[PDB]
Amino acid sequence: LQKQVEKVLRKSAYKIVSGEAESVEVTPENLQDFVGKPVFTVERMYDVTPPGVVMGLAWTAM
Amino acid sequence: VTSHIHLHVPEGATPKDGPSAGCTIVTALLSLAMGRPVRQNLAMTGEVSLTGKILPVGGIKE
């Protein structure tokens, strides 16, 4: 999240200097052209679990 | 089900991107099961999930 917000702020600064826009009022419609399209679209692997597959919670290193 | 098989996967791929070849392997075996050559001029990459779902992979541009 820090990386993405930094990217958006960097592009806002570039547009303020180069684009000459006085200020950036970021909205989701605008967001698409700053960060691009969303990498994550589906929350889980399986929206519906077929037979023999079950989701389980794991406590990993991170 | 009953045939000892040897497969050669050329090296060069970084291990993190190695599972992206898994999908390929599947069809390869399927072809060798029915002797139908894979359609020419076809590329394919992806990670199999033991049930059929294909996971995203990196290095799509390269």
Side-chain angles (χ1 to χ4, degrees), chain A residues 6-60:
Chain A
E6 272 168 30
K7 179 181 283 174
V8 173
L9 288 177
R10 279 195 331 262
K11 282 190 201 322
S12 275
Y14 161 73
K15 194 171 285 184
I16 281 162
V17 181
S18 56
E20 295 172 349
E22 194 285 304
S23 49
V24 195
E25 313 311 337
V26 169
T27 51
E29 46 266 49
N30 319 144
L31 167 57
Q32 276 296 83
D33 57 38
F34 290 3
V35 305
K37 297 146 269 167
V39 294
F40 299 153
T41 67
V42 193
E43 34 176 12
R44 291 141 61 181
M45 193 167 327
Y46 292 87
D47 194 2
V48 300
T49 51
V53 77
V54 181
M55 57 193 317
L57 315 178
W59 179 29
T60 172

Short mmCIF file of all heavy atoms in Angstrom, two decimals, chain A residues 6-60:
data_model
loop_
_atom_site.label_atom_id
_atom_site.label_comp_id
_atom_site.label_asym_id
_atom_site.label_seq_id
_atom_site.Cartn_x
_atom_site.Cartn_y
_atom_site.Cartn_z
N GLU A 6 2.81 5.91 -2.83
CA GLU A 6 3.98 6.66 -3.28
C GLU A 6 3.97 6.83 -4.79
O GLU A 6 4.30 7.90 -5.31
CB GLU A 6 5.26 5.94 -2.84
CG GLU A 6 5.75 6.35 -1.46
CD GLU A 6 6.83 5.43 -0.93
OE1 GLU A 6 7.58 4.86 -1.75
OE2 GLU A 6 6.93 5.28 0.31
N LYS A 7 3.59 5.78 -5.53
CA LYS A 7 3.49 5.88 -6.98
C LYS A 7 2.47 6.94 -7.38
O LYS A 7 2.72 7.77 -8.27
CB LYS A 7 3.11 4.52 -7.56
CG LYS A 7 2.96 4.50 -9.08
CD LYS A 7 2.55 3.12 -9.57
CE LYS A 7 3.72 2.15 -9.58
NZ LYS A 7 3.29 0.76 -9.92
N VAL A 8 1.30 6.92 -6.74
CA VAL A 8 0.25 7.88 -7.08
C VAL A 8 0.71 9.30 -6.78
O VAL A 8 0.49 10.22 -7.57
CB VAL A 8 -1.06 7.54 -6.34
CG1 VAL A 8 -2.09 8.64 -6.55
CG2 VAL A 8 -1.60 6.20 -6.82
N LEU A 9 1.36 9.50 -5.63
CA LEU A 9 1.85 10.83 -5.28
C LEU A 9 2.94 11.29 -6.24
O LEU A 9 2.99 12.47 -6.60
CB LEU A 9 2.36 10.84 -3.84
CG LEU A 9 1.29 10.76 -2.75
CD1 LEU A 9 1.94 10.70 -1.38
CD2 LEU A 9 0.32 11.93 -2.83
N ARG A 10 3.82 10.38 -6.66
CA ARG A 10 4.85 10.74 -7.63
C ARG A 10 4.22 11.18 -8.94
O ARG A 10 4.65 12.19 -9.53
CB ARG A 10 5.78 9.55 -7.87
CG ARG A 10 6.85 9.36 -6.81
CD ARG A 10 7.94 8.42 -7.29
NE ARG A 10 7.43 7.44 -8.24
CZ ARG A 10 7.08 6.19 -7.94
NH1 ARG A 10 7.16 5.73 -6.70
NH2 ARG A 10 6.64 5.39 -8.90
N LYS A 11 3.22 10.45 -9.42
CA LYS A 11 2.57 10.84 -10.67
C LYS A 11 1.81 12.15 -10.51
O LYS A 11 1.77 12.97 -11.44
CB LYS A 11 1.64 9.72 -11.15
CG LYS A 11 2.39 8.58 -11.81
CD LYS A 11 1.47 7.60 -12.50
CE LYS A 11 2.15 6.25 -12.69
NZ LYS A 11 3.59 6.39 -13.05
N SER A 12 1.22 12.39 -9.34
CA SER A 12 0.57 13.67 -9.08
C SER A 12 1.58 14.81 -9.13
O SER A 12 1.31 15.87 -9.71
CB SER A 12 -0.14 13.64 -7.73
OG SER A 12 -1.43 13.08 -7.84
N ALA A 13 2.75 14.61 -8.53
CA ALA A 13 3.79 15.64 -8.58
C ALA A 13 4.25 15.88 -10.01
O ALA A 13 4.43 17.03 -10.43
CB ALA A 13 4.97 15.23 -7.70
N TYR A 14 4.43 14.81 -10.79
CA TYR A 14 4.84 14.97 -12.18
C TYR A 14 3.80 15.75 -12.97
O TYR A 14 4.14 16.64 -13.76
CB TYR A 14 5.06 13.60 -12.82
CG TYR A 14 5.03 13.62 -14.33
CD1 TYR A 14 6.08 14.17 -15.06
CD2 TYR A 14 3.96 13.10 -15.03
CE1 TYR A 14 6.06 14.19 -16.44
CE2 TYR A 14 3.92 13.11 -16.41
CZ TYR A 14 4.98 13.67 -17.11
OH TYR A 14 4.95 13.69 -18.49
N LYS A 15 2.52 15.44 -12.76
CA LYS A 15 1.46 16.17 -13.46
C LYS A 15 1.39 17.62 -13.01
O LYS A 15 1.05 18.50 -13.80
CB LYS A 15 0.12 15.47 -13.23
CG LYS A 15 -0.99 15.95 -14.16
CD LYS A 15 -2.23 15.07 -14.05
CE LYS A 15 -2.03 13.74 -14.75
NZ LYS A 15 -3.27 12.92 -14.74
N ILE A 16 1.71 17.89 -11.74
CA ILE A 16 1.71 19.27 -11.26
C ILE A 16 2.85 20.05 -11.90
O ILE A 16 2.68 21.22 -12.28
CB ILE A 16 1.81 19.29 -9.72
CG1 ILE A 16 0.43 19.00 -9.11
CG2 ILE A 16 2.34 20.63 -9.23
CD1 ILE A 16 0.48 18.56 -7.66
N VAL A 17 4.02 19.43 -12.05
CA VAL A 17 5.15 20.11 -12.68
C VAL A 17 4.97 20.14 -14.19
O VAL A 17 4.93 21.21 -14.81
CB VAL A 17 6.48 19.45 -12.28
CG1 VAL A 17 7.66 20.17 -12.92
CG2 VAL A 17 6.63 19.43 -10.76
N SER A 18 4.87 18.97 -14.81
CA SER A 18 4.75 18.89 -16.27
C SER A 18 3.32 19.18 -16.72
O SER A 18 3.09 20.08 -17.53
CB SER A 18 5.19 17.51 -16.76
OG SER A 18 4.45 16.49 -16.11
N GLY A 19 2.36 18.41 -16.21
CA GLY A 19 0.98 18.59 -16.64
C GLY A 19 0.43 19.96 -16.31
O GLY A 19 -0.57 20.39 -16.89
N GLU A 20 1.07 20.67 -15.38
CA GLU A 20 0.71 22.02 -14.97
C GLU A 20 -0.64 22.08 -14.27
O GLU A 20 -1.15 23.18 -14.02
CB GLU A 20 0.71 22.99 -16.16
CG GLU A 20 2.09 23.20 -16.77
CD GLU A 20 2.04 24.00 -18.06
OE1 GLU A 20 0.93 24.22 -18.58
OE2 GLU A 20 3.12 24.41 -18.54
N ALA A 21 -1.23 20.93 -13.93
CA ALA A 21 -2.46 20.93 -13.15
C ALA A 21 -2.19 21.50 -11.77
O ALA A 21 -1.21 21.12 -11.11
CB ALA A 21 -3.02 19.52 -13.05
N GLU A 22 -3.05 22.42 -11.32
CA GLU A 22 -2.83 23.06 -10.03
C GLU A 22 -2.88 22.05 -8.90
O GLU A 22 -2.05 22.10 -7.98
CB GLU A 22 -3.87 24.17 -9.82
CG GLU A 22 -3.55 25.12 -8.67
CD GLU A 22 -3.80 24.51 -7.31
OE1 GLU A 22 -4.94 24.05 -7.06
OE2 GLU A 22 -2.86 24.48 -6.49
N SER A 23 -3.84 21.13 -8.94
CA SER A 23 -3.99 20.14 -7.88
C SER A 23 -4.59 18.88 -8.48
O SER A 23 -5.21 18.90 -9.55
CB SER A 23 -4.87 20.66 -6.74
OG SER A 23 -6.07 21.24 -7.24
N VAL A 24 -4.40 17.77 -7.77
CA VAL A 24 -4.90 16.46 -8.19
C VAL A 24 -5.96 16.03 -7.19
O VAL A 24 -5.67 15.81 -6.01
CB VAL A 24 -3.77 15.42 -8.28
CG1 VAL A 24 -4.24 14.20 -9.05
CG2 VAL A 24 -2.54 16.03 -8.93
N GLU A 25 -7.20 15.91 -7.67
CA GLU A 25 -8.31 15.38 -6.87
C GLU A 25 -8.51 13.93 -7.31
O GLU A 25 -9.29 13.64 -8.21
CB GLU A 25 -9.57 16.21 -7.06
CG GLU A 25 -9.35 17.72 -6.96
CD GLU A 25 -8.55 18.13 -5.74
OE1 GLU A 25 -8.53 17.36 -4.76
OE2 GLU A 25 -7.94 19.22 -5.77
N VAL A 26 -7.79 13.02 -6.65
CA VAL A 26 -7.78 11.63 -7.07
C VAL A 26 -9.11 10.98 -6.73
O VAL A 26 -9.60 11.08 -5.60
CB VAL A 26 -6.61 10.88 -6.42
CG1 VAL A 26 -6.75 9.38 -6.63
CG2 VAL A 26 -5.28 11.38 -6.98
N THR A 27 -9.70 10.31 -7.72
CA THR A 27 -10.92 9.55 -7.57
C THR A 27 -10.71 8.21 -8.25
O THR A 27 -9.83 8.07 -9.10
CB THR A 27 -12.12 10.28 -8.19
OG1 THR A 27 -11.80 10.69 -9.52
CG2 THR A 27 -12.49 11.50 -7.36
N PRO A 28 -11.51 7.19 -7.89
CA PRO A 28 -11.27 5.86 -8.49
C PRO A 28 -11.26 5.89 -10.01
O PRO A 28 -10.42 5.23 -10.63
CB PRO A 28 -12.43 5.01 -7.93
CG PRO A 28 -13.42 5.99 -7.39
CD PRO A 28 -12.63 7.17 -6.95
N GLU A 29 -12.16 6.66 -10.63
CA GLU A 29 -12.16 6.77 -12.08
C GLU A 29 -10.81 7.25 -12.59
O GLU A 29 -10.30 6.77 -13.61
CB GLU A 29 -13.28 7.70 -12.55
CG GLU A 29 -13.38 9.01 -11.78
CD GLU A 29 -14.37 8.94 -10.63
OE1 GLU A 29 -14.30 7.98 -9.84
OE2 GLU A 29 -15.23 9.85 -10.53
N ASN A 30 -10.20 8.21 -11.88
CA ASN A 30 -8.87 8.67 -12.25
C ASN A 30 -7.82 7.62 -11.91
O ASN A 30 -6.83 7.46 -12.64
CB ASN A 30 -8.55 9.99 -11.56
CG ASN A 30 -9.72 10.95 -11.54
OD1 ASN A 30 -9.92 11.69 -10.57
ND2 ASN A 30 -10.51 10.96 -12.61
N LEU A 31 -8.02 6.89 -10.81
CA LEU A 31 -6.97 6.00 -10.31
C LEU A 31 -6.48 5.05 -11.39
O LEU A 31 -5.29 4.73 -11.46
CB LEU A 31 -7.50 5.22 -9.10
CG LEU A 31 -6.67 4.02 -8.63
CD1 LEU A 31 -5.24 4.45 -8.30
CD2 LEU A 31 -7.32 3.36 -7.43
N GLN A 32 -7.39 4.61 -12.26
CA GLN A 32 -7.02 3.62 -13.27
C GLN A 32 -5.86 4.10 -14.14
O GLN A 32 -5.03 3.28 -14.55
CB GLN A 32 -8.23 3.29 -14.15
CG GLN A 32 -9.16 2.23 -13.57
CD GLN A 32 -8.49 0.87 -13.43
OE1 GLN A 32 -7.79 0.62 -12.46
NE2 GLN A 32 -8.70 0.00 -14.41
N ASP A 33 -5.79 5.40 -14.42
CA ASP A 33 -4.73 5.92 -15.28
C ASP A 33 -3.49 6.36 -14.51
O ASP A 33 -2.52 6.80 -15.14
CB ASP A 33 -5.27 7.08 -16.14
CG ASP A 33 -5.84 8.21 -15.31
OD1 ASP A 33 -5.29 8.51 -14.23
OD2 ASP A 33 -6.86 8.80 -15.73
N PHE A 34 -3.50 6.25 -13.18
CA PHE A 34 -2.30 6.48 -12.38
C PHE A 34 -1.56 5.18 -12.09
O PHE A 34 -0.39 5.02 -12.46
CB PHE A 34 -2.65 7.20 -11.07
CG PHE A 34 -3.08 8.63 -11.24
CD1 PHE A 34 -3.19 9.20 -12.50
CD2 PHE A 34 -3.37 9.41 -10.13
CE1 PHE A 34 -3.58 10.52 -12.65
CE2 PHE A 34 -3.76 10.73 -10.28
CZ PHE A 34 -3.86 11.29 -11.54
N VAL A 35 -2.22 4.24 -11.42
CA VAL A 35 -1.59 2.97 -11.08
C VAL A 35 -1.81 1.91 -12.15
O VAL A 35 -1.06 0.92 -12.18
CB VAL A 35 -2.12 2.44 -9.73
CG1 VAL A 35 -1.94 3.49 -8.64
CG2 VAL A 35 -3.59 2.04 -9.85
N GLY A 36 -2.79 2.08 -13.02
CA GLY A 36 -3.15 1.06 -13.98
C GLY A 36 -4.37 0.28 -13.54
O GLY A 36 -5.18 0.71 -12.71
N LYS A 37 -4.51 -0.91 -14.12
CA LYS A 37 -5.62 -1.79 -13.80
C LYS A 37 -5.30 -2.62 -12.56
O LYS A 37 -4.13 -2.83 -12.22
CB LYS A 37 -5.92 -2.70 -14.99
CG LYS A 37 -6.38 -1.94 -16.23
CD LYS A 37 -5.91 -2.60 -17.51
CE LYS A 37 -4.56 -2.05 -17.95
NZ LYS A 37 -3.94 -2.89 -19.00
N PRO A 38 -6.32 -3.11 -11.86
CA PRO A 38 -6.07 -3.85 -10.61
C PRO A 38 -5.46 -5.21 -10.88
O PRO A 38 -5.97 -6.00 -11.68
CB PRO A 38 -7.47 -3.97 -9.99
CG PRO A 38 -8.40 -3.90 -11.15
CD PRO A 38 -7.76 -2.98 -12.15
N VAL A 39 -4.35 -5.49 -10.19
CA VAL A 39 -3.70 -6.79 -10.32
C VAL A 39 -4.56 -7.88 -9.70
O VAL A 39 -4.64 -9.00 -10.22
CB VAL A 39 -2.29 -6.76 -9.68
CG1 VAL A 39 -1.39 -5.82 -10.46
CG2 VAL A 39 -2.36 -6.35 -8.21
N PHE A 40 -5.23 -7.58 -8.59
CA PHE A 40 -6.06 -8.54 -7.88
C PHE A 40 -7.53 -8.25 -8.18
O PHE A 40 -8.00 -7.13 -7.97
CB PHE A 40 -5.80 -8.47 -6.37
CG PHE A 40 -4.38 -8.80 -5.99
CD1 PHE A 40 -3.83 -8.28 -4.83
CD2 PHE A 40 -3.59 -9.61 -6.80
CE1 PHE A 40 -2.52 -8.57 -4.48
CE2 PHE A 40 -2.29 -9.90 -6.45
CZ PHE A 40 -1.75 -9.38 -5.28
N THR A 41 -8.25 -9.27 -8.66
CA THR A 41 -9.64 -9.10 -9.06
C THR A 41 -10.54 -10.08 -8.33
O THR A 41 -11.71 -9.78 -8.06
CB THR A 41 -9.77 -9.28 -10.58
OG1 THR A 41 -9.49 -10.64 -10.93
CG2 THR A 41 -8.82 -8.35 -11.32
N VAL A 42 -10.02 -11.27 -8.01
CA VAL A 42 -10.77 -12.31 -7.32
C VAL A 42 -10.16 -12.49 -5.94
O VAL A 42 -8.95 -12.71 -5.81
CB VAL A 42 -10.77 -13.63 -8.11
CG1 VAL A 42 -11.81 -14.59 -7.55
CG2 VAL A 42 -11.02 -13.37 -9.59
N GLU A 43 -11.00 -12.41 -4.91
CA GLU A 43 -10.50 -12.48 -3.54
C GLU A 43 -9.84 -13.83 -3.26
O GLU A 43 -8.76 -13.89 -2.67
CB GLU A 43 -11.63 -12.24 -2.53
CG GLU A 43 -13.00 -12.77 -2.94
CD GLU A 43 -14.05 -12.58 -1.86
OE1 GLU A 43 -13.77 -11.85 -0.89
OE2 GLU A 43 -15.15 -13.16 -1.99
N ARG A 44 -10.48 -14.92 -3.69
CA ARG A 44 -9.99 -16.26 -3.43
C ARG A 44 -9.66 -16.96 -4.74
O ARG A 44 -10.05 -16.52 -5.83
CB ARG A 44 -11.02 -17.11 -2.67
CG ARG A 44 -11.25 -16.69 -1.23
CD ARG A 44 -12.73 -16.79 -0.88
NE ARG A 44 -13.22 -18.16 -1.02
CZ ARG A 44 -14.47 -18.54 -0.80
NH1 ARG A 44 -15.39 -17.67 -0.41
NH2 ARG A 44 -14.80 -19.81 -0.97
N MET A 45 -8.93 -18.07 -4.63
CA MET A 45 -8.73 -18.95 -5.77
C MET A 45 -10.07 -19.45 -6.29
O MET A 45 -10.48 -19.13 -7.41
CB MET A 45 -7.83 -20.12 -5.38
CG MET A 45 -7.30 -20.92 -6.56
SD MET A 45 -5.95 -22.08 -6.20
CE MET A 45 -5.05 -21.26 -4.88
N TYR A 46 -10.78 -20.21 -5.47
CA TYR A 46 -12.06 -20.81 -5.85
C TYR A 46 -13.19 -19.98 -5.25
O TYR A 46 -13.34 -19.92 -4.02
CB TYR A 46 -12.14 -22.26 -5.37
CG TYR A 46 -11.19 -23.19 -6.08
CD1 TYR A 46 -9.89 -23.36 -5.62
CD2 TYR A 46 -11.59 -23.91 -7.19
CE1 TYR A 46 -9.01 -24.21 -6.26
CE2 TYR A 46 -10.72 -24.77 -7.84
CZ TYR A 46 -9.43 -24.92 -7.37
OH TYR A 46 -8.56 -25.77 -8.01
N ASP A 47 -13.99 -19.34 -6.11
CA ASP A 47 -15.23 -18.74 -5.65
C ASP A 47 -16.19 -19.81 -5.15
O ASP A 47 -16.88 -19.62 -4.14
CB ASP A 47 -15.86 -17.91 -6.76
CG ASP A 47 -16.96 -17.00 -6.26
OD1 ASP A 47 -17.21 -16.98 -5.03
OD2 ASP A 47 -17.58 -16.30 -7.08
N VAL A 48 -16.26 -20.94 -5.86
CA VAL A 48 -17.00 -22.11 -5.43
C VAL A 48 -16.03 -23.28 -5.36
O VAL A 48 -15.28 -23.52 -6.31
CB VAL A 48 -18.18 -22.43 -6.37
CG1 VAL A 48 -19.15 -21.26 -6.43
CG2 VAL A 48 -17.67 -22.77 -7.77
N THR A 49 -16.04 -23.99 -4.24
CA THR A 49 -15.09 -25.08 -4.04
C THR A 49 -15.59 -26.35 -4.71
O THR A 49 -16.66 -26.84 -4.34
CB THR A 49 -14.88 -25.32 -2.55
OG1 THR A 49 -16.16 -25.47 -1.91
CG2 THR A 49 -14.13 -24.16 -1.91
N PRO A 50 -14.87 -26.91 -5.68
CA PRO A 50 -15.26 -28.21 -6.23
C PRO A 50 -15.04 -29.31 -5.21
O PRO A 50 -14.49 -29.07 -4.13
CB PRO A 50 -14.34 -28.38 -7.45
CG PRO A 50 -13.20 -27.46 -7.19
CD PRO A 50 -13.78 -26.29 -6.46
N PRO A 51 -15.47 -30.54 -5.51
CA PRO A 51 -15.24 -31.64 -4.57
C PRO A 51 -13.75 -31.87 -4.35
O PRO A 51 -12.93 -31.76 -5.26
CB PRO A 51 -15.89 -32.84 -5.26
CG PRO A 51 -16.80 -32.27 -6.30
CD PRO A 51 -16.21 -30.97 -6.71
N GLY A 52 -13.40 -32.20 -3.10
CA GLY A 52 -12.05 -32.57 -2.76
C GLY A 52 -11.10 -31.43 -2.46
O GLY A 52 -9.92 -31.69 -2.17
N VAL A 53 -11.56 -30.18 -2.53
CA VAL A 53 -10.73 -29.02 -2.23
C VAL A 53 -11.38 -28.24 -1.10
O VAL A 53 -12.59 -28.00 -1.11
CB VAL A 53 -10.53 -28.12 -3.47
CG1 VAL A 53 -11.77 -27.28 -3.73
CG2 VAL A 53 -9.33 -27.22 -3.27
N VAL A 54 -10.57 -27.85 -0.11
CA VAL A 54 -11.06 -27.10 1.04
C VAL A 54 -10.05 -26.02 1.40
O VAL A 54 -8.84 -26.28 1.44
CB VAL A 54 -11.32 -28.03 2.25
CG1 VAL A 54 -11.84 -27.22 3.43
CG2 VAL A 54 -12.30 -29.13 1.88
N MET A 55 -10.54 -24.82 1.68
CA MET A 55 -9.68 -23.73 2.11
C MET A 55 -9.39 -23.84 3.60
O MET A 55 -10.28 -24.14 4.40
CB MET A 55 -10.32 -22.38 1.81
CG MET A 55 -11.68 -22.17 2.44
SD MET A 55 -12.58 -20.74 1.80
CE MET A 55 -11.29 -19.50 1.74
N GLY A 56 -8.14 -23.60 3.98
CA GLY A 56 -7.73 -23.62 5.37
C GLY A 56 -6.81 -22.46 5.69
O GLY A 56 -6.00 -22.05 4.86
N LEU A 57 -6.92 -21.94 6.91
CA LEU A 57 -6.12 -20.79 7.30
C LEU A 57 -4.74 -21.23 7.76
O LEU A 57 -4.60 -22.23 8.47
CB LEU A 57 -6.83 -20.01 8.41
CG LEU A 57 -8.33 -19.79 8.17
CD1 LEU A 57 -8.96 -19.06 9.34
CD2 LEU A 57 -8.55 -19.03 6.87
N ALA A 58 -3.72 -20.47 7.35
CA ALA A 58 -2.34 -20.80 7.63
C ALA A 58 -1.63 -19.59 8.22
O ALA A 58 -1.85 -18.46 7.79
CB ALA A 58 -1.61 -21.25 6.36
N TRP A 59 -0.77 -19.85 9.21
CA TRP A 59 0.05 -18.83 9.85
C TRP A 59 1.46 -18.98 9.28
O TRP A 59 2.26 -19.78 9.76
CB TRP A 59 0.03 -18.99 11.37
CG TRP A 59 0.87 -17.99 12.10
CD1 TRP A 59 1.16 -16.72 11.71
CD2 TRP A 59 1.51 -18.18 13.37
NE1 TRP A 59 1.96 -16.11 12.65
CE2 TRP A 59 2.18 -16.98 13.68
CE3 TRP A 59 1.59 -19.25 14.27
CZ2 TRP A 59 2.92 -16.82 14.85
CZ3 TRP A 59 2.32 -19.08 15.43
CH2 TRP A 59 2.98 -17.88 15.71
N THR A 60 1.75 -18.19 8.25
CA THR A 60 3.02 -18.30 7.54
C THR A 60 4.05 -17.33 8.15
O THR A 60 3.78 -16.62 9.11
CB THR A 60 2.83 -18.03 6.05
OG1 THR A 60 4.11 -17.96 5.41
CG2 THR A 60 2.09 -16.72 5.81
#
